[PDB]
Amino acid sequence: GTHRFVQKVEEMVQNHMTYSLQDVGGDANWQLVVEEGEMKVYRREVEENGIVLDPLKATHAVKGVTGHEVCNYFWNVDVRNDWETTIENFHVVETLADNAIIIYQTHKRVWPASQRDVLYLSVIRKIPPETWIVCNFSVDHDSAPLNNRCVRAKINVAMICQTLVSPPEGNQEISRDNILCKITYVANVNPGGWAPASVLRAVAKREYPKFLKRFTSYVQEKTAGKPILF
Ligand SMILES: CCCCCCCCCC(=O)OC[C@H](CO)OC(=O)CCCCCCCCC
C-alpha cells in the first residue's frame, strides 16, 4: 500500500492477528452467549459513561470454502446486498487501492432509536494456511461530515479466515470435501449514543449470529461446484 492509511491498516491487521486470533473458549473474561452448529458467539460486557461497548468475538468453521473466498465475499461491495440485512444504503466514498476503500453507510433501525450511520475503511489483506483478513474501521473523511439525521457509530471489525486442507490420497485431486475455513469474526462497536442496555445486548445476540449463519451459507452456495480459489 502507497496510500495515507497504510500505517493504520497495518497496525489494525497486526493487532487482530496477535489479539483477535487467541481462543476465548477457555478465557474466563469472555462469555459464550450463542452456540449453534460450529458457530460460537462470545462477548465481554463493557459499559463506559452509560454506553454499551461489549466487544463481540465469534468463531465458526465452514466446510467446502477457502479463507480467500470468504474474505472476498465479505469485502466485495458488489455482493453486499446479496447477504446483508441491516444496511439501509451505502456507497464507496473513496478508493484508496485495489484492496482498500472508504465506505459510508446508513443502517436500518435495528433497535428503537435514531438510525446510525458509519464511515469506515474496508481493506482485504493476505498474511503469509496463509491468513486472509478483512478489517473494517471508522475513519473521518472531508466528504462525509457528521450530521443531524444520524448518530455516528464507531466500529472496529474484522473477519479473519484460515483454510485447513486435507488432500486425498490415491490419484484423486483436491475437492471442496477436503477443505474447511476457520473463521474468527470480531466486532467492537460504539453505538454512538445512549440506549437501554438490555435492548442493545439483545439486538447484538440476535443480529450477529443471524449474519454469520446467512453469510457463511451464502458463500457456501456461491462457491459450490466451482474451482477452488485459495
Ligand atoms: C447500527 C448498528 C451499529 C453499527 C454496527 C455495524 C457492525 C458491522 C460494520 C461492518 O463492518 O459492516 C460491513 C461488513 C462487511 O465488510 O459487514 C459486517 O460486519 C456484518 C455485520 C452485520 C451485523 C451487525 C449487527 C449490528 C447490531 C448492533
Alpha-helical regions (H) of 112-176: none
Distance CA 25, CA 188 (A): 18
What is the identity of the amino acid at 107? H
116 in contact with ligand 1, CB cutoff 6 A: yes
- The answer to whether 48 and 192 are in contact (CB under 8 A) is no
Residue ranges making up the domain that contains 203: 1-230
Does the annotation flag 105 for ligand binding? yes
Total Cβ atoms within 10 A of residue 174: 13
Ligand 1 atom with minimal separation from the 185 CA:
19
Q: How was this structure determined?
A: X-ray
What is the per-residue burial (b if ≥16 Cβ within 10 Å, else e) of 207-227?
A: ebbebbeebbebbbeebeeee
Cell of 18: 496477535
Cell of 32: 459464550
Distance CA 45, CA 100 (A): 31
121 in contact with ligand 1, CB cutoff 6 A: no
CA of 103 to the centre of ligand 1 (A): 12
Which residues are CB-neighbours of 33 under 8 A, at least 6 positions away? Answer: 41, 42, 43, 205
The CATH number of residue 106's host domain is 3.30.530.20
Testing ligand 1's pocket by substitution, the residue of 82, 124, 136 carrying the most ligand atoms inside 8 A of its CB is 136
Nearest residue (CA) to ligand 1, atom 13 = 136
195 in contact with ligand 1, CB cutoff 6 A: no
Cell of 129: 494456511
* Closest CA relative to residue 70, chosen from 226, 157, 182: 182
Residue found by looking up cell 496477535 in the block: 18
Backbone angles phi, psi at 214, to 5 degrees: -60, -50
Does the annotation flag 136 for ligand binding? yes
- The answer to whether 101 and 90 are in contact (CB under 8 A) is no
Distance CA 122, CA 110 (A): 22
- The answer to whether 101 and 95 are in contact (CB under 8 A) is yes
Q: Is the dihedral of CA 98, 102, 106, 107 positive or negative?
A: positive
Nearest residue (CA) to ligand 1, atom 15 = 74
CA 216 to chain CA mean position, Å: 11
Number of domains in the chain: 1
Pair type for strands 151-152 and 116-127? parallel
Which residues are CB-neighbours of 108 under 8 A, at least 6 positions away? Answer: 86, 87, 88, 115
